[PDB]
Amino acid sequence: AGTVVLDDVELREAQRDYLDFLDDEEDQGIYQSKVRELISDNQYRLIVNVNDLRRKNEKRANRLLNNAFEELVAFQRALKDFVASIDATYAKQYEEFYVGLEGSFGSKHVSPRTLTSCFLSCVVCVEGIVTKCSLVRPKVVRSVHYCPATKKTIERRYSDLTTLVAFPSSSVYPTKDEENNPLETEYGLSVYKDHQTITIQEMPEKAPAGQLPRSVDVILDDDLVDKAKPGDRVQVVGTYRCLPGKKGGYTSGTFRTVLIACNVKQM
Amino acid sequence: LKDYALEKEKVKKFLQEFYQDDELGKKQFKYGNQLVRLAHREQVALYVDLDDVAEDDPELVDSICENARRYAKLFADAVQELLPQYKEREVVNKDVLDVYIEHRLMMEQRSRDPGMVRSPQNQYPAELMRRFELYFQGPSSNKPRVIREVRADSVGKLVTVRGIVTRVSEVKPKMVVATYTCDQCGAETYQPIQSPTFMPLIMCPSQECQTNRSGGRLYLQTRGSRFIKFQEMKMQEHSDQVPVGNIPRSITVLVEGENTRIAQPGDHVSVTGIFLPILRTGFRQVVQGLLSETYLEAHRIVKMNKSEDLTREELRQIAEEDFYEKLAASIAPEIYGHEDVKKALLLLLVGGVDQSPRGMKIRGNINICLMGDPGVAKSQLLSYIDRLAPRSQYTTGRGSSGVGLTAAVLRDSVSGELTLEGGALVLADQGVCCIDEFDKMAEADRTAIHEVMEQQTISIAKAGILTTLNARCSILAAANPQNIQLPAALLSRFDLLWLIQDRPDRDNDLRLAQHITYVHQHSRQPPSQFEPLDMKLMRRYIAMCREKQPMVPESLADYITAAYVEMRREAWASKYTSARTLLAILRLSTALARLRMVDVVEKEDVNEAIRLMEMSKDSLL
Amino acid sequence: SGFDDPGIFYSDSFGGGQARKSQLQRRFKEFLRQYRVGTDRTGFTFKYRDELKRHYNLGEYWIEVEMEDLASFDEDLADYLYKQPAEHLQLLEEAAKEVADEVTRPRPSGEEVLQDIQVMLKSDASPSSIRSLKSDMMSHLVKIPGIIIAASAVRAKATRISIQCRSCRNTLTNIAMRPGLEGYALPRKCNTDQAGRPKCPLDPYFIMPDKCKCVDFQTLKLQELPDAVPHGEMPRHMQLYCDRYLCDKVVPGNRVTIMGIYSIKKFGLTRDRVGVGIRSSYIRVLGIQVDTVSPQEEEEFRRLAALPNVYEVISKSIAPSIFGGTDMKKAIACLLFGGSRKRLPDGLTRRGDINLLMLGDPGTAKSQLLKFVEKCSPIGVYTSGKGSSAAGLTASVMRDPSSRNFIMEGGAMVLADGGV
Amino acid sequence: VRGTPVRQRPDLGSAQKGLQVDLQKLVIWGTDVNVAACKENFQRFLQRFIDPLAKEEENVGIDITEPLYMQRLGEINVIGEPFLNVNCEHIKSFDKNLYRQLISYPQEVIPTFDMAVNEIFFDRYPDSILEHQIQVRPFNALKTKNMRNLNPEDIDQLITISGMVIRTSQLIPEMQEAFFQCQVCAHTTRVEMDRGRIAEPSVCGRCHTTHSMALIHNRSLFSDKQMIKLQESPEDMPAGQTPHTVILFAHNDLVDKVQPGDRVNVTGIYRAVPIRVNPRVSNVKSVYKTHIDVIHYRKTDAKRLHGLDEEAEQKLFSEKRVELLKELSRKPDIYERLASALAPSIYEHEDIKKGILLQLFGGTRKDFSHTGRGKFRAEINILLCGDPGTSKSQLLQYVYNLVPRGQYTSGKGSSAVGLTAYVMKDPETRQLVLQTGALVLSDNGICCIDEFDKMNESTRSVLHEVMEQQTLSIAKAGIICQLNARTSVLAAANPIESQWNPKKTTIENIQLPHTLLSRFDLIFLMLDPQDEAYDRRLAHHLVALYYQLDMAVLKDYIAYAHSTIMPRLSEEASQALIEAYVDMRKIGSSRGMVSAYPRQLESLIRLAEAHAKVRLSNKVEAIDVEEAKRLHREALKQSATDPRTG
């Protein structure tokens, strides 16, 4: 065991606000209906209108659009809690639920040419044309292993550290038992999520005529992998972050920036 | 979990709006007045009574008793925030640390720029600018714990224990906030010390030096720093609370600030404080883990049950002429008979006036030696006097011998020095030392006792120790048998040598047997016409007498001289008396006058002194 | 009592030929606060103070300083900023941050964290030839003319990093990165080993990305002026590093003047390249000057259009030097002013741009009229039927096989969008 | 200033920042002293301060009319010693705020006083030459009656305490100005100490070679230092408090000025310094230790006699006092007057008081080195053999509290090693050092041995060497030496059975070996005569103590006697001494009496010389030898004992 968090005022406030926003019975009921819809359709992502969130709570809107990662974590915790309240049996099926955004983003609506350093860690909405669309590779998030010698079964958990500092111990894939017995990975029991990387280019008509294009790299996790193909015009909403390099005693200031799409919609 | 801003508001509310009728029945803001005082810098220690807190907020009391350190800091910060609004005038700068605080505040105001936000570390620390200290007084509902039972399960809690103080270091300056001054910029740096050790800083982190990217070596110094009176004592279990076969357990108590100089070795104390650990790094820990020491941080020290630090009823009791006999009969009510012996013991407990005529001291202490056959309650009398007197050390034959009576030298821990620790005589320096089996006591110990009687000091010229101690104690020896063993050595020194022979006698033996059997029946002496005074009352009366120095009028000079000459003639005719006997007369008469609580001794006091002396003398025959 | 460790607190620097860097920063702050432009007749204003306030309120966080102003107010500051631009530029930057904070102090919630104020600079001194960039001018402030022939994408360069130890997870937040092309060597040993006797490994630190204060940075390729290149020679080149608000300020083709620090790459002192002690030189860009409506002009246009014979004055004014062709000149004025572009509810559009053709004998000044129209139009490109030299007529799009990006080669038609 | 080099003040510690802060006058940071105001106030105090209650005897060579310290500056001009002792009591009387500032900020204030004194002195004298600028010593600050009551609030303040010196370590050199030389071009530079440290050049100033500069230890400049372990004499002695040992530190002029056993009032700065966890690491302890940077040593005491140093000093008495003492000597009953003055509240012990007075005066020091004879003991030894309760202990304590360099031991509380010397581990240098004992601490004074019979021979044997040759030859495992122990022994003995049997002879009652008893040159039998008049008068005196010559004149008389009185035997006194010894031996040949050996002729010479010194004769006379005879005879009650029985 390690340093767990006992109580966190900001996280508690954020989760309470998001659960209140999602619970709509004294209000019109838009988002209660939307959650019921996704339950019926067997999905695990909810599209929440930033305009509605700003209308019901300006502070939560500003916090979500300016510090997206932890705010989206709190929003997704609230979403899972609400889905459990509506029906726990379905909430148990899916490990986590995701919160994509839509609506109008005032200054966070940018093109790949205008997506600069100022928008790091913020939620941004970028409309552009797809140029590159890599293959959908499975990324293992929970690996099950079996030791024929001792008949034991083990589970190794890998955190999604795409943009967080990652240490080798996290990514060590186990192959031998404690006493160096061989471990066989059980693919039927392990858990993998589809992962894809695409590139969004400034629309040729909207880009300045004189200069060369500008593009941004977009990471699509499960449920957002095959939504776009090269040449399509799409709107991707997500967090603009910095990718960690690799372990090294020397580093240049340069960082490789990407966009972890939280939702992708067709032009 | 709890919101400590809300807790701070709660403690502010209590400290501001708590009132009591303590001041002569008139309603008073008990803590408001104290806040005014210590905002004016007229008071230093603020003792928050958790009974007072529980009077209106029991849950706050429970939270304090569970996390006392946290709430100790909350209370201190609340007091500091409230002080400015309670200040009503300018302090007179009674202290150099007050001068430093004034200069610091003035310069911070001068360079305020109120709207600007200064970095969290670019500010004076709280402890650097307090000049006060907040302690608790444990709630009465909390039963005192046993030092043995105070364990890891109650770390950080507020607990109160009682025991005998064995070892107490001296008061020495303990750094609380180390102040450094740079050699380039001219700012100051503050290191709040929390661990038992600290590594002095080398580089000045001031903004000016950081911008200049200069050396910025800073110099630790004591001028601007913040020390606190510090002491470390060892507190020992009480005999009655130790398990069947075990030895008493000790606890370490760290005393700070105004709690210092309260307790001294040998005192029976009750200490209330927080049970806190000290990290135990540095050693080659055999077992893995974060092992730590344990100590009690002293918040409230109260001498109790032997050395606790008026009414019309007691004034009338004193005014009664038979008050002397009342006290005498109250001395050990269980012991039947020995009326004159108990009167002599009372005179011992009171003592005569000290004299300092032209460069030589005639001490007023009274020395009494109880010679007697077996089973005449000499040991019981000495034990009772030990329990009664404030500073009493009861030493048996040889268990406390050599350095058990005289001081020795022991290595320290706070300083690692060689500190001189007193023996039984020093622990009873200005009280009563009840020596039992004085005849069988060693020769060196007997010579030490003779020296303390003759001089009240203890000179030592051994290898590790070379000092002239001070032991102004009164010796109450209880030897057994010139009859059959009546040393002139004892005769020449003891001011009152009493022989207690128990010749068989039907009537007296039957009365004593009835007394004993009733005592064993009812755990108390047989009821008498006068109820014996409680030990607290006896101590109070004796203490009040002690500070009532009566002088000897020149009128009694010839009377005393005539009595002394008559006794000299009687002794010469018979088959011992000297200036020692005359001084015994003088100091016994002075102590009797003091008991009567007058300023001038009288012929009645002289006659009583002579009567007791003659009873002692003819006890020999 | 040995468990917790409070920080190290400190106070202000009360009390107390070279001038200390704090003194020079104070002088920069006073220059920003107390530089006065105007006259008693026209009043006085604090140019840099009000510029800082306006920029910070708008959300810019940058200003531009005039070297002539700085030298007039405090000549020694100007000389220091010329001789050692880097350190003194940082001093000026922090002075600007302080002045901005104290002029916008009552900021609303949310916008409370004081932001860094970039300080670009410009001077009226004539720029120096690129070929004059000898070695005596290394690390100095240099103003050079050139033309940008390329501009890399804008990427994120970290200004602060937070490195966390793998063993104890303790952090070393806020490590000040150097500006420009330069790297940082991470600490090899976790200094916070006192919290526990068992020791952390060697080279234990991983950079935490999410705790990095990054800024925009860009790389440009400056080429000597073609009119500056001697007759038989090659165009010299230089590499430009551009910072937060110098990114995308210029685009390929612009003829610019760059004021910056002549600096060499410092990345660790580690077939071809037979030389030794040679490092990639570059100019760290501080100020970019790209070379070639007020209410007064608003009311001027209003009155000029309100004139009765606006049509006649415009027609006679466009091409004064060409004889005759009055009808063609009126048509040219109508072409310049254009009709009205319309979109109907169904979505269709009606163009508001007139199309004019001038068939005629070669003697007439048709080419001259076209040249004047191109020169006078707000956005106007003069080309030929077969495009132009290295510039097509219409637009083509080609996918680059390597990067897969669709490069849009723009012809005259797409370059003169909303124009002539 | 006149070009004189301003020597540093190591006692005032490492110089501080000295930050000036304006309160809107221009105080020093953390204080309320302004250098200009303090300097002006002290300059005024020097220029015009007169003591109205001053006495011509209290101040010698000082007019009570002219300003006090201007005469002191004149003295410092006459002699080379550039020091000025200034009484903090005088400062308090003149300017109370100046006194408070001095006491609370010594390091800051005292340099201002130094500046002021230098200014005045060099203005008055434009030609006087001094090795260094005059330095001010503030003493007599309000006495701290107990160090245990001082608090962290008092740190770095000028306090004053009193006590006897237990030990004085060796001369420790301290760096003041490092000398550096280049290992390439031999370029030389000097780096003065600054705030308790030195900055290495790190670069040569001539060849610019980095780190070519090396420190030259023995070409640097150093200053003296000395640890002094002192035992406090707290006037206020709370119950249960043991004696106190406090570390002192002398600096560059007070080093080796107070020997062990000397009693002194030490004024100095009360310092607190950190304790390293180990002598090799720099981690320190949260709890500091305290010591005293000594500023001033004062030997003079009111309740004691003049010390050896004061007696040695020439200007100890005014001519008026000298004439007064000579008149008191020419007085015919000076002997009895002084005997009665000694222990004024001890009733008619005339002979014992006379003997103790002779012990205080002491015989003559003789240089028998040329004779190859050895060293002769000029001290007088007294043994009071008496019943307990005969006031012998009171007389012992009176002498102990009266004499400088006095030590006291009782009964079985002492040991041979503890009296002679021993080896301990000085717990500040972690080094093994040698610590003296009582007999050495009382080297040039008195040792009072109460309960001299309960002194088991193991330790009583030590006294033979001390009382015979004034030497203590220690030959232990590592250290061999002979310590000077030129003490005078005053011992108290109790007859066997604690009571004097009136049937056993003198020796049988004393029960001390003749080898030892022959060393004591005076033995007084405190025996009780059952006398009505004695008992009545004693009772009157003892009761009078219960309701109600000058120490000054006695002290001055003894000091003058020791200073310039060296009695020499005359021919008539020599013949008288010969006859006295033969008669005394003839008498002592008796069975049980105290037999007389030539040690008794030595004792008679000692006593006669002491009496001549008391008379200031400078020539021992038949009167003195006869008085010695009478005293030695009345002691032991030879007249009252028959040559057969007691």
Ligand SMILES: Nc1ncnc2c1ncn2[C@@H]1O[C@H](COP(=O)(O)OP(=O)(O)O)[C@@H](O)[C@H]1O
């Ligand atoms: N006079 C007395 N009155 C009451 N109890 C007595 C008396 N004398 C002796 N005793 C009892 O006898 C026992 C022995 O007494 P102790 O104090 O040992 O006498 P000693 O001092 O002679 O040894 C004790 O338990 C005590 O209670």
Ligand SMILES: Nc1ncnc2c1ncn2[C@@H]1O[C@H](COP(=O)(O)OP(=O)(O)O)[C@@H](O)[C@H]1O
């Ligand atoms: N009407 C005119 N007025 C003044 N100058 C003229 C006129 N026509 C022609 N020119 C001159 O003769 C030159 C030839 O005309 P040009 O611009 O080549 O037209 P184009 O080649 O299109 O017929 C022009 O550069 C101009 O200077």
Ligand SMILES: [Mg+2]
């Ligand atoms: Mg007994």
Ligand SMILES: [Mg+2]
């Ligand atoms: Mg043409």
Ligand SMILES: [Zn+2]
């Ligand atoms: Zn500094």
Ligand SMILES: [Zn+2]
């Ligand atoms: Zn680590």
Ligand SMILES: [Zn+2]
């Ligand atoms: Zn050199």
